[PDB]
Write a structure and sequence with these properties.
Length: 608
Amino acid sequence: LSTSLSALPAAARDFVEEAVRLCRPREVLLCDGSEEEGKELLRGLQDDGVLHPLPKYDNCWLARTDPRDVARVESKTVLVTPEQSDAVPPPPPSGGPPQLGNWMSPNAFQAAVQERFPGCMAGRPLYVIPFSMGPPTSPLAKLGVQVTDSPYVVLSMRIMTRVGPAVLQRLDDDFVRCLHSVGRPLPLTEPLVSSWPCDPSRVLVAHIPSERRIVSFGSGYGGNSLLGKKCFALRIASRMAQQQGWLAEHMLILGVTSPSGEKRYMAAAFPSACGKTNLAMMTPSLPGWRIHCVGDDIAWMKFDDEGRLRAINPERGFFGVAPGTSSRTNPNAMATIARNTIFTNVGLRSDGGVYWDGLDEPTEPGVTYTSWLGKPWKHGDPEPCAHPNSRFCAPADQCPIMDPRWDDPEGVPIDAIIFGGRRPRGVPLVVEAFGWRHGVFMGSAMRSEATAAAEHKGGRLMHDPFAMRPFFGYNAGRYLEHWLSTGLRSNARLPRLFHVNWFLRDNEGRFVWPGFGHNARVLAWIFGRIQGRDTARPTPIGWVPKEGDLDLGGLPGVDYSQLFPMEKGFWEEECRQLREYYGENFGADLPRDVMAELEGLEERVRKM
Ligand SMILES: Nc1nc2c(ncn2[C@@H]2O[C@H](COP(=O)(O)OP(=O)(O)O)[C@@H](O)[C@H]2O)c(=O)[nH]1
Ligand SMILES: [Mn+2]
Ligand SMILES: [Mn+2]
């Protein structure tokens, strides 16, 4: 932290000064990303009562938030473009709410800003965060400057991005302008809940691609406040990617090593809270196999001149869902979060440790709990001890399984792309596409039960094409056409496309597939298919593994038949819904090739 801004280059200084003019902070501080800075930020937050120490561990901290500020708010997230059609497909003719992004005009946006931001930082410091996405480096690392009035956001940005001296030395005219405020100028007129500043009814997370700008107001929660992450690395970047010949995707990246010692890399698009983190740092239940983590959330991908799809992880940390994490489900996450980690909305134990449903950290008898509400909690209570969307925020270099190449500027070559979401019935454990166009169709057709990561009724089955529904930075029809065109790249070594489902439910009423480390059995088959092994049989929906080429050894309770349902009625209904969905939400912006693939599916279904 410093009061000198002189280290900022001209363009960055200009942006900071106009943000200072608008918001009227009490003082202005440049962040340097240092250890001493981190300590001073931690102390200040403990004073404010925002952070609580966790003495059981090494430099770990707990925040509790206002119950209204616990997740992303998709209905208050907008794309600001001169023309609506650049942001979103035609508004649904039946008049329902848009499902592929919310357009806001530049004029509506300017008005919205003038109603929220003037004097919003009164009595608060404005922190200047120069940051880099990817090694700074690299390239193609992309740099940004985030201003914020929240020390919590500063600390989280320091974990999740590179901040900020090697960043300062590279920073020029070329950068994202990220403006954030929790939107609670001092003095307060009404009290905070859990010392957590936020303005729920006034929340606005805006993206202005043509200005290389993000403007976020009223929320301190991760997806709304860590502007390099979803806002920049997905929304702004996907628009940049489309015009520059690359891809910015909601995808984990991992390395798989086979018993033969062969290593391949795979990307996987799952919706939020649908298994990316647990897969990316999985400990395989097949000991002849090895997994390495590259990233758990965002992938930037570009074909090299070898025609290979190269992927980097632009992030520096993990912002992972805590509930469910244990030495059974994710022992690699357990090792990662043991030190230098900020927890949000998890339980506090009387022994100075943390708690959530699933955690199996050895605890003494008579240990008591306080919930994310900050109130005493007991095994048996109506609600969970930890919020369903509670988080850990930990630096990636503390993961014991990081791929030797995880911060390699060149990227890793991708041989498989995997789509998947939560589907309780009908959709098999694993399917391989018949080819590129078909796999793009499968991606577009993705549906997944809503989770606690945003404002949707948990359990509601929702379309989520490419797991990108909340994160499109431009017209989703054009995004599909971009994916189609990508596969037409001359001499491209295309990855194979797959669709998985970890979440089929049995009768009754558990999960059919044990998942977690056992997902290595699926990845093994996928790797086999990459190697070109004759291990698949065709179905109306794509290739599936032959029974006997999918390793179910040591899973006596698990039946192949339940993993691979193939019911005509289900798929007839699915086609009907897809037809309805595309028509309402994509309209004329739906690529012909996607409709052609739907017609292909309906035709294969006719044969059943
Ligand atoms: N049943 C089951 N649950 C899983 C699996 N993988 C992850 N989960 C759970 O789903 C929730 C979200 O997991 P996570 O990997 O963090 O999702 P992400 O946000 O997509 O990275 C957590 O509570 C996990 O325990 C799986 O293979 N099977
Ligand atoms: Mn995500
Ligand atoms: Mn997660």
